[PDB]
Amino acid sequence: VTCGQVDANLAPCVPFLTQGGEPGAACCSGVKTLNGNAQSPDDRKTACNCIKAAANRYPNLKDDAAQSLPSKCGISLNVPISRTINCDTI
Amino acid sequence: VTCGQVDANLAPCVPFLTQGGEPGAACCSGVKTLNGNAQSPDDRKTACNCIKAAANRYPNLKDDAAQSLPSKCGISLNVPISRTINCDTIS
Numbered sequence A: 001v002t003c004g005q006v007d008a009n010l011a012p013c014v015p016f017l018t019q020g021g022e023p024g025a026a027c028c029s030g031v032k033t034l035n036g037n038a039q040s041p042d043d044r045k046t047a048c049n050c051i052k053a054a055a056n057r058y059p060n061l062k063d064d065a066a067q068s069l070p071s072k073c074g075i076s077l078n079v080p081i082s083r084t085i086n087c088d089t090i
Numbered sequence B: 001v002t003c004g005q006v007d008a009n010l011a012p013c014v015p016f017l018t019q020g021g022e023p024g025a026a027c028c029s030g031v032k033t034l035n036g037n038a039q040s041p042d043d044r045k046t047a048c049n050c051i052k053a054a055a056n057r058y059p060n061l062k063d064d065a066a067q068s069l070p071s072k073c074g075i076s077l078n079v080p081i082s083r084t085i086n087c088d089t090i091s
């Protein structure tokens, strides 16, 4: 996994992550793809740092949307979406 | 490249990165390895964020030691080592 595919996977989540509402089919599909590429702990740490960068790309980001995405998509997201996560814990 | 490889390659650089002086042979070897695994720009951004994490792992780290590591090792590191870099800016 690489930061560029992570960016690609989360691009359709930008509306939900910045304006709220519901993530939608494309967002959840991208998140599922990314969760599938983040199976091992190494992959998970790399994806976590990539996601931290993507999350920090937007100051308008809503923490409640980021925190509710995994349950709104019905996925056990191994990598949380936050601007302040320390990816060494993953 | 992956964050675990970044951690492993930079582990022998921790003494220089926290107390200064000169990087050991193993440190410079790890840095050259990392320069070699980061061929594409995607690779470079991934390595940059991994390196940001590793750099933030110790606040006792000296940022100037991090900035001087590649030239002290005599290698042009295509990816900068910083605790506060926004990795979207790099090429």
Ligand SMILES: CCCCCCCCCCCCCC(=O)O
Binding pocket: A011, A012, A013, A014, A015
């Ligand atoms: C000109 C940019 C190409 C299209 C990407 C849109 C950039 C703004 C983000 C708006 C949300 C788009 C989500 C999506 O990719 O479906």
